């Protein structure tokens, strides 16, 4: 098991890529899957040691380039939108 | 009470329509201009707001 | 001048008490956006 890293998994019902952060809420004994307000999988139960892990996508935002303009400079600044870094 | 702006959202087809598949990206080449226009409209909306 | 100042202070207190008792214009501009986003996610299913 690898946690806090962007990995792919197949937890018997889905094929989602994301990190597995340690949770703070306990599930019911017969709950195997999780759900939120939207129709996106956000929680799942590990069948090994009955551990609850969160789901978080890693691809956030895009790439923004800052340019001083023409006839002024030649170097640019690279900005990422909404990712931790 | 008078609102002046609201939430700024940016949506791209490469993350919404297609997930982690390559066939969807190949099939979206025929509709790439549509997504370019939608992204430009959303960018202009964000800039105006 | 004292009467008008007291009237202004009482009016300010009145709008302070009335605002604490909800907003309609500021709540819709978030509610329709939330509904549109929810419909956007729901269309994926």
């Amino acid at each position: 098991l690898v946690k806090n890293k962007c990995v792919n998994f197949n937890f018997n019902g889905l094929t989602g890529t994301g990190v597995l952060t340690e949770s703070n809420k306990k599930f019911l004994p017969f709950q195997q899957f999780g759900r939120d307000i939207a129709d996106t999988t956000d929680a799942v139960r590990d069948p090994q040691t009955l551990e609850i892990l969160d789901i978080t996508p890693c691809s956030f935002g895009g790439v923004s380039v800052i340019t001083p303009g023409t006839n002024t400079s030649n170097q640019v600044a690279v900005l990422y939108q909404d990712v931790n870094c | 009470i008078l609102p002046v702006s609201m939430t700024k959202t940016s949506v791209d087809c490469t993350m919404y329509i297609c997930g982690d598949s390559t066939e969807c990206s190949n099939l979206l080449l025929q509709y790439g201009s549509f997504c370019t226009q939608l992204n430009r409209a959303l960018t202009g909306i964000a800039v105006e707001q | 001048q004292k009467l008008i100042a007291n009237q202004f202070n009482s009016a300010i207190g009145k709008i302070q008490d009335s605002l604490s008792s909800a907003l309609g214009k500021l709540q819709d501009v978030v509610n329709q956006n939330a509904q549109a986003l929810n419909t956007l996610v729901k269309q994926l299913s």
């Binding site: 691809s59 | - | 605002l19 986003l37």
Partner: peptide, 24 residues
């Protein structure tokens, strides 16, 4: 501020405003 009160999990990112609440 207190009177008036996932969605980003499918690529629907949100851009923060240029002017923050403290600047306003």
């Amino acid at each position: 501020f207190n009177k008036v009160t996932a969605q980003k999990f499918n690529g629907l990112t949100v851009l923060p405003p240029l002017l923050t609440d403290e600047m306003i």
